[PDB]
Point group: C3
């Protein structure tokens, strides 16, 4: 049939031939049947979701087969043929729970290349498929081999720098999508979706299966599964709750420095610097005269546009200011 | 008028992309107010007529310049000798005046001046700098143009290596150009070129200092110093505190901004902000005399620049308070005197 | 009378142009090394007594590897590798856990912490700061600050970069050790001397100072200051703060410190601190019984160390409250015991 995706990767394996990591230069969403046909026989692809290793020699064949069908992929395989490191071609018939490390990595590539958006792809059971790895200046290094390599570097007056020890590498070591800034790339995980015109500042962080439509200024934390709409700004040190109700931020929102949200934010919401709006926070909802409409749980204001959340600096009450009348607010609360 | 006495000059080695756009320039020994002797020796070889200039120059010219400066400035001469061997492209940037920058090379020089501490935040004209500072991939092999990156990432992978991309931004990190004396910076990813880190300052891991910002020194920085924010002598910014971006926010001498707190106003000398409190410009504050009685309720904004304030949030009634050691008459004078 | 040592380790390190030690790396540090090891090794090193950082030669390295052949295979193998080294070697033999007296020793004690051979507060780190020189931590390793500018220039001349990722007295831990069963998202944020317990994951916003850390397991996404130890199964939410240092702050077992919150007191077991709340020691808290009636207004300091407390700020009246599943009578007894 029509495949969901395919990509030709170069990766790394440990001493026991386990896959630590795979890099895909040119992943494809819904590749053309012409490409799949030409490639399927050579790789030994029958059906379903497969991570198929292949050889330098098979690389040259595949390069030739795709000459004249897709120039881009052919030139990639031609480079892949000179590779010292092992090769995998992962071909996915369906968008399903991943079954291999190679597939898990491809699906995170699809997100970070912006082929698919957060929540558009199945990442169920990915965690056991992503091995904990030492991310170093020489690449991924298995934790069982690391101490030895660290010693040998020191003997030569050198340093094996270990900049991360984790199941997810940092995105920019695999892709930097167009029209994006990321001040400290240590803080954006492979699998993050950084929309065009987004700038993630130093205090900003974006988990996998999360990100920004773009444009936007991210200076706080976007947790797994959180997606931030168009033109929204997250101030320095702000928090977006993780972990059911998914957290999102709408369009044109402003989340203040050091503040936080545990509810989904509707469009053009503002949260005061320093304010943490928890799902069960009891909020004094105010109409456009700043008169109490009623006290509600923050959870119940989820998705409503044009709210300003603030903590009253004289009586300590968390207040939600609107430009709507009481009868309007009550209507919104019940539909 | 004829050729002047310059604002700055520096000999730099930088990096260009395939279309010869400058990504980046490194100046080892930048000069504030260089002597007329240095300029007179160098100008004819560089072809510097007047004003503010980013003049590319050759290896041969580098030797010529080293010779001309021999016996005028030993340091500069020696640098030019080294520069003459370089593989990378050279630029001499001579600025007659401190004006809005007109080139990437000039932009980079002005950020160096700040980070070498030759000038302080706000003393230098940085207007319109963003469009001169191209977005670049800062990698372990240096600056790399974004259109050239994906290719280079592939080639490293094919050799079993990694092209590490530690930052994608218009500003590189300062310490890849300068580490000024008497300074600690725990995670250097968090101090931009253009930051001024004063002697005896320590920037901890959670600390951050933008361009055109920083510390007099000494001090402990563990929160975020936004662009244009200067922190006096002996002031401490607690872990994860915030200073608001952008009128001008500053911090006086001897302040303590609590962990996870924040300021949207200039804090006068010896102010204290309680851990967890965000003092917003429009925050309504209970100003209290000694004896802790209410003087009026003011906007935090009207307390800007006042010394010896303690800011706190009453833990029993939620009121943001400013405690003072002053009478109602004293406070009246401090807030309203002409 | 020569003793039975607190610690010993063979290190390879880096010196500046004035032969001052910037840094030492210990591959396999020993806690309470056997008398058999100390006896084979001491005459070659010239160890006499006490706490000693003893430099040694490549030839001495071979001798030591030969002496420990058939006593401790691992140490012998290490010494054989050290014999090939281009960098200078030191053997640090510590008779006692005492205030450190050398850069070599200060580094060993932090190694002991990070290998998890000892726990935070179990080791004497008194006066350590003067022993740990401020160093530029680069991609080529430790560099003296007086030599750095020159090396920065030379890299630029070759179109390369001398990356300078930290300028500090403490390097990052993972450049020395990655202990088993641990995840650290951004390793710039865990210092040598951190104790990161098995099953701990330190996310990107997490930070752990020296002489601090986690029993394990747990999720650390906030700041663990020096001298702060966090019990089994406790979660520190994103950007939470743990006050620095005379009450020593600690977090008990099974606690939840919310995102952007903070503690200036020790937290007893199974405590919860609402997201965004900072609880300082002088913070006045409304202590509520299992029926949510006011029992008493107390300073948070006096609730420190009690189990099963939920700290929250009342979103309607601004009062910092502490909720419990105990009666007024049980609570008053705890405040008076
Ligand atoms: C919440 C926020 C948006 C409100 O500011 P605002 O409404 O735009 O501007 P103002 O301060 O003029 O608001 C008007 C009134 O609210 C009052 N006010 C503001 N915050 C208050 C509070 N927490 N409690 C009581 N009154 C408050 C002001 O004093 C003023 O009173 P007035 O009507 O008697 O003049 C702002 O204070 C804030 O927190 N912004 C966050 C920005 C940020 O953190 N990051 C962006 C990138 S740095
Ligand atoms: C704001 C701060 C300075 C107040 O503490 P302080 O003035 O040093 O000393 P205390 O805590 O003893 O204050 C004295 C009184 O005020 C009370 N108090 C303190 N904070 C209060 C609050 N927020 N609401 C009501 N009462 C409070 C104390 O209970 C005590 O009451 P008492 O007069 O009945 O005995 C402090 O709590 C703080 O937040 N410091 C920030 C440090 C930090 O975050 N980082 C530094 C880097 S390690
Ligand atoms: C404080 C906290 C623990 C309370 O949550 P909870 O008790 O488990 O769940 P609930 O929301 O049902 O709380 C129960 C009651 O408290 C109320 N409540 C919660 N916070 C309140 C507040 N600050 N002021 C007043 N009421 C509050 C709820 O409305 C609810 O009221 P009800 O009994 O009238 O229906 C939670 O809000 C919190 O801060 N969690 C921190 C988690 C975090 O930041 N990170 C975890 C790692 S991702």
């Amino acid at each position: 049939q029509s495949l969901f995706s395919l990509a030709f990767g170069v990766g790394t394996q440990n001493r026991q031939e386990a896959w630590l990591e795979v890099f895909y230069a040119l992943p494809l969403l819904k590749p053309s049947s012409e490409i799949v046909a030409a490639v399927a026989p050579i790789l030994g692809y029958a059906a379903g979701n497969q991570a198929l290793t292949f050889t330098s020699q098979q690389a040259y064949q595949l390069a030739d087969a795709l000459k004249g069908i897709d120039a881009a992929q052919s030139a990639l395989l031609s480079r892949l043929a000179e590779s010292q490191k092992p090769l995998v071609a992962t071909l996915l018939a369906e968008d399903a729970a991943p079954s291999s490390t190679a597939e898990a990595y491809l699906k995170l590539h699809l997100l970070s290349h912006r082929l698919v958006k957060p929540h558009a792809v199945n990442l169920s059971g990915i965690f056991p498929l992503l091995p904990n790895v030492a991310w170093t200046n020489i690449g991924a290094v298995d934790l069982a081999e690391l101490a030895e390599l660290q010693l040998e570097a020191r003997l030569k007056g050198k340093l094996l720098e270990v900049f991360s020890v984790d199941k997810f590498p940092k995105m920019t070591d695999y892709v930097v999508p167009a029209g994006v800034r990321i001040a400290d790339t240590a803080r954006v995980r492979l699998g993050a979706y950084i929309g065009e015109g987004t700038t993630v500042m130093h205090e900003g962080f974006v988990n996998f299966n999360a990100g920004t439509e773009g444009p936007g200024m991210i200076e706080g934390r976007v947790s797994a599964g959180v997606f931030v709409g168009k033109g929204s700004d997250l101030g320095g040190g702000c928090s977006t709750m993780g972990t059911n109700i998914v957290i999102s931020v709408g369009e044109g929102c402003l989340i203040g420095a050091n503040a936080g949200i545990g509810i989904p934010l509707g469009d053009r919401n503002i949260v005061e610097a320093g304010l943490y709006i928890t799902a069960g926070t009891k909020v004094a909802l105010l109409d456009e005269q700043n008169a109490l409409v009623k006290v509600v749980k923050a959870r119940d204001l989820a998705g409503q546009p044009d709210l300003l959340f603030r903590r009253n600096s004289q009586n300590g009450a968390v207040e939600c200011k609107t430009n709507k009348t009481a009868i309007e607010l009550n209507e919104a609360l019940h539909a």
